[PDB]
Amino acid sequence: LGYKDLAAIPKDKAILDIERPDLMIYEPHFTYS
């Protein structure tokens, strides 16, 4: 299967899509934005 498929390495980078990382809130997540 290869090493690429055995480990669930993320294909996409989530940090690129985001705006202004200082205004990020971790502890609630029930919404996409």
Q: Give the 3-state secondary structure of residue 11.
A: coil
- Least gap, CB of 6 to another protein (angstroms): 7
Please classify residue 2 by burial: count the beta carbons closer than 10 Å to its beta carbon, then call 0-12 exposed, 13-18 middle and 19+ buried: exposed
Site for another protein in 1-30 (CB under 8 A): 1, 3, 5-10, 12-30
Binding residues for another protein, rule CB under 8 A, total: 28
Q: How far apart are CA 9 and CA 16, in angstroms?
A: 16
Least CB distance to another protein at residue 11 (A):
9
Interface contacts to another protein, rule CB under 8 A: 1, 3, 5-10, 12-31
